[PDB]
Symmetry: D2
Subunit: 112 residues, 4 copies
């Protein structure tokens, strides 16, 4: 699994479940091509986005729909979405995001 | 000053100086129009981006150029940039301060919204 | 002002006002001596804790009373308090600004150290 | 496993390995009694700190020795250690910490 995303809720101290996200790859013309999407599981994780053969080097954007997550919990948030934009480099990627209504953090753990 | 950005460097324990950022506003056709741009000062702040009159309701994207920042210091970071996307002014004018704390493989961003 | 603390609330997008904090300095016998205390203002800042003369080298603990803060708002948080422990002034006097961003189950803290 | 700790390094984008920590329980006289300790594994995790029978309600402190971690990497950090102080309440606890030299964040995920 080359690319995994994990989302945590800082208000409830829980996995952020049923959070939608879309992954985009940057195309030669600088537009964002849909690449992969899904919703986090009960453990706040989204696995199976892509495969090692498909996940070639390039710039990707993960757009996490944080606004709908907070709306379904009855809480007005600041951001429209969270965006994590990175280059995938051949020299496993776990993207993590901690959500608060007016703040979020994101970190990448890149391992073997 | 209705929209200010402050950036901090978590490796050095200092303001993040000379960080470039581009602000965009979503147009009627769903594209991102350029709105304002600038770079942080020696206190890590960027003031004067826009005015109360020009900062009307809309969806704004602050794109902070973190990769350029870290590269200029010889560090190869993870992200291309930090993106802060939010609806502004949709219950009347507010003042926004967006903060970002930068590490090479992580960042955090928060907004303080006053009236 | 050699030691300032700024606290932000990540649920409300605001300064964290009336947050109490106690600063301790490690004594020769390895115990924590009370050093200064105060509470944040309406801008979420606490200034005037100490003076250049009194803030000598040592190991300091800033204990931020986050549980009292959240409880006063009807939220049951996870932490008792946020603790920031650091050696100060050990290459000469510096100015420290400690920031903390508070959520009910998480917090972050950063220091900016100037000379 | 009632109590797990996970530590991540924000400079290298990696698990923080071989990080020492000690866990204390608050005693009736307000002192901190040693309770459990260990070092994070290759995956940045420390499991097996305590058992469900021993982990009774009370106030605990996890002291993460972040200073020695940065020192062994040749980097001068700000904090002496990171401290996470919480009440364990019978109404599984995963404590996570993201380390930077001049900053850290910590979150709790409390699940069933
Ligand atoms: C918000 O703090 C947390 C947190 O509560 C849980 C976290 O869980 C993670 C789990 C992971 O497997 C991995 C990958 C580690 C490998 C060795 C592949 C993680 O990086 C995390 C977390 O980063 C994590 C975090 C910290 C992330 C933030 C504060 C954006
Ligand atoms: C939560 O992210 C914020 C934030 O929203 C506001 C912040 O305000 C600061 C103001 C400051 O003057 C200084 C000192 C900079 C000097 C040149 C002395 C700050 O460091 C901050 C912030 O740290 C700050 C932050 C980031 C702090 C976190 C993420 C714990
Ligand atoms: Br949008
Ligand atoms: Br640009
Ligand atoms: Br300047
Ligand atoms: Br890009
Ligand atoms: Br602010
Ligand atoms: Br006290
Ligand atoms: Br005041
Ligand atoms: Br306590
Ligand atoms: Br100490
Ligand atoms: Br977790």
């Amino acid at each position: 699994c080359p690319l995994m995303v994990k989302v945590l809720d800082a208000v409830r101290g829980s996995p952020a479940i049923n959070v939608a996200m879309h992954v985009f790859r940057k195309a030669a013309d600088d537009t964002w091509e849909p690449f992969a999407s899904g919703k986090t599981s009960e453990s706040g994780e989204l696995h199976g986005l892509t495969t090692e053969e498909e996940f070639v080097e390039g710039i990707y954007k993960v757009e996490i729909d944080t606004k709908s997550y907070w709306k379904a919990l009855g809480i007005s948030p600041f951001h429209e979405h969270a965006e994590v934009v990175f280059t995938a480099n051949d020299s496993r990627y776990t993207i993590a995001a901690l959500l608060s209504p007016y703040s979020y953090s994101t970190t990448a753990v890149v391992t073997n």
